[PDB]
Amino acid sequence: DEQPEPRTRRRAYLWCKEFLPGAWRGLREDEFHISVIRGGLSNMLFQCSLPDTTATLGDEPRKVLLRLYGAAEAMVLESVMFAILAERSLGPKLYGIFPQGRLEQFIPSRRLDTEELSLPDISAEIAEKMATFHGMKMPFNKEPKWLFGTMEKYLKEVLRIKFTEESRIKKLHKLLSYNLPLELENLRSLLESTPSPVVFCHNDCQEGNILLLEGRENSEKQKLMLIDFEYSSYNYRGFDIGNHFCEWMYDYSYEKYPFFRANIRKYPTKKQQLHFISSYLPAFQNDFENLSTEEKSIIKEEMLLEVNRFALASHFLWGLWSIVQAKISSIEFGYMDYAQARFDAYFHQKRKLGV
Amino acid sequence: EQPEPRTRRRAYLWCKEFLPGAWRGLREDEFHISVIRGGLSNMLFQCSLPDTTATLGDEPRKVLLRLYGAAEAMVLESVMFAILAERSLGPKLYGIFPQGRLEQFIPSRRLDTEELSLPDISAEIAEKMATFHGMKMPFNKEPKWLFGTMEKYLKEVLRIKFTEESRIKKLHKLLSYNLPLELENLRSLLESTPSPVVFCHNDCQEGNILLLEGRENSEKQKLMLIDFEYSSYNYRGFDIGNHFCEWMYDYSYEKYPFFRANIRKYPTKKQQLHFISSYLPAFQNDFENLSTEEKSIIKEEMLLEVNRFALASHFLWGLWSIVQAKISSIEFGYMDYAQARFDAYFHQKRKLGV
């Protein structure tokens, strides 16, 4: 986490030398500056750079980002998608693609923290960016089968899990006592009666996937970038917004077990919600502000009902996801606790909605 | 003309789910499909709306379905195809799935071999190739493809045994040239021949060049290059040299051996200069403002570059054809083709005095 091991220092040297143009092409192995940004057995991020002494021959970058995958059809789609967003200037540039990983533009930035999501200027721009993402045409299946198809898939895995550790057994037993198969069908009824346009959705728009771009912090409307499009698909718009509202409540930076904080009281208020969708709607159809005040009020009221219902699917889906991570993950986290938190929020909001 | 019923139904669902507008509510009984290209790999179909169905927005009325049929190649080609589309250099990409893809249907036909020498065609092939060559692509910029591939095919060639009389007497003549030595002399000649490394098509021939329907009367901007299976960072001289060699080869002949070869059809110096006089301003910013002397010098050197790299075209595709002779799936005179390429290789050596 300041240097990498002996192999994936040299592999990254070759990659950078072979895939990057200009001064990268004639670089000796002992000039190569690499330093870890994130580790793991999956999705390792490194920074790779020229020495500061070396000058550039053309418009090649000084530093890049190396992304290793780390043990077919999933990787074609996200690669094509990444390449497309890169060409449309809606993502970081793609400098190299190979079986083990890819070379990307390094964006000087940090991630938002959870508590920044509520800042009015942050929220307004997230809404604008999300509305732009939602207008994109992508070469993927336009049927909104992702939401229930993913929930069904995770539920099938959840019902096959057997734990051996007593504490995980007891926690799983409590989640199963809810009758998740039946609860999924109640959510199906609710959501099939809630109209929500099908759009190209990020599906994971939270603070860890939003960049605050270095030296733009005084821009009111143009300091952020959305990244990490792994779960993206054509989906109900209500889910991308509702999932985002859910993410106000969750902080994944907590340093002790269970490695997250959950706070129901941080969900956005009607006022905060209205502020977000007041920025989202004119960004998605730019004639919106010319509708009658009454016609706009009706649209906003409908959309509050829409997004707060689809937010229940955020809890259900990521709760099921977390139980699966508990069995199969070797990243360290309170997966079972996070699942319980998502299902606690599910039942609390359901009851508040009267649905 | 009409595909198998299972293909009809798979195509219908791909179209219905990947394409917007009137496609989303089309019934199976309204769906039109026909075969454009059979085979075992890269089957092509045209899929269309009924003539009496109106579009609802900007969706196409007709698309092309490509089925792969029979790893790190699929992502590369898919990424490249998407990128060309985003840059308005290729057909749009409307759908990608594991079995294939949906693309913009471009009314067009492929050129014939004889059309390569039409001056307006030749000039535009050069401009398009220059444009290809200036593209940044996220692929390996190390020029290993050419000799990498020649070495790989030579090996397979050396350890191949044939049954019949005809194939063994043909393989005997080819091996009698001492191909491992020729490779190393070719390698030496090309290492002494400066040629920039650029993103190359590697197969720029008449069958990979579309003439766009309705644009026949335009001098310029009536072609499109397609089919980048062999594309890679490579020496520029190879892309041009290979294209010049393809003036000599017609792959549309219907009797065995299923090609014609004509050494006299290689472009004359004048034809070659016409080509590179269109290429150079499309590749190099202010080429036209250079002195007459500097332009002449750049062109003379480039003719030497490309005519030396043409040797590698003959060599590489000669080897390729022998290999295809053993592991063939397809009906063609591969060994005859291979002999035509080595004959041209030796002719071009003489011409060059090397």
Ligand SMILES: COc1cc2c(NC3CCN(C(C)C)CC3)nc(C3CCCCC3)nc2cc1OCCCN1CCCC1
């Ligand atoms: C389970 O999900 C996350 C786990 C995360 C996580 N885990 C850490 C890893 C190190 N580990 C150490 C004690 C060994 C502590 C546990 N760390 C971080 C960073 C680490 C750097 C400092 C800031 C925060 N972000 C995370 C984001 C996560 O999800 C984001 C949204 C997920 N959506 C909803 C569900 C799936 C899609």
Ligand SMILES: COc1cc2c(NC3CCN(C(C)C)CC3)nc(C3CCCCC3)nc2cc1OCCCN1CCCC1
């Ligand atoms: C000589 O090389 C090719 C010959 C080909 C060929 N020949 C057909 C076989 C069927 N046969 C019929 C009597 C049955 C008539 C002769 N057919 C096809 C398909 C078959 C499906 C329908 C037509 C289209 N593709 C070919 C691709 C070829 O090139 C290999 C690809 C790249 N190479 C690299 C160097 C240049 C091109």
Ligand SMILES: [Cl-]
């Ligand atoms: Cl366990």
Ligand SMILES: [Cl-]
């Ligand atoms: Cl049930």
Ligand SMILES: [Cl-]
């Ligand atoms: Cl476009």
Ligand SMILES: [Mg+2]
């Ligand atoms: Mg959050």
Ligand SMILES: [Mg+2]
């Ligand atoms: Mg030809």
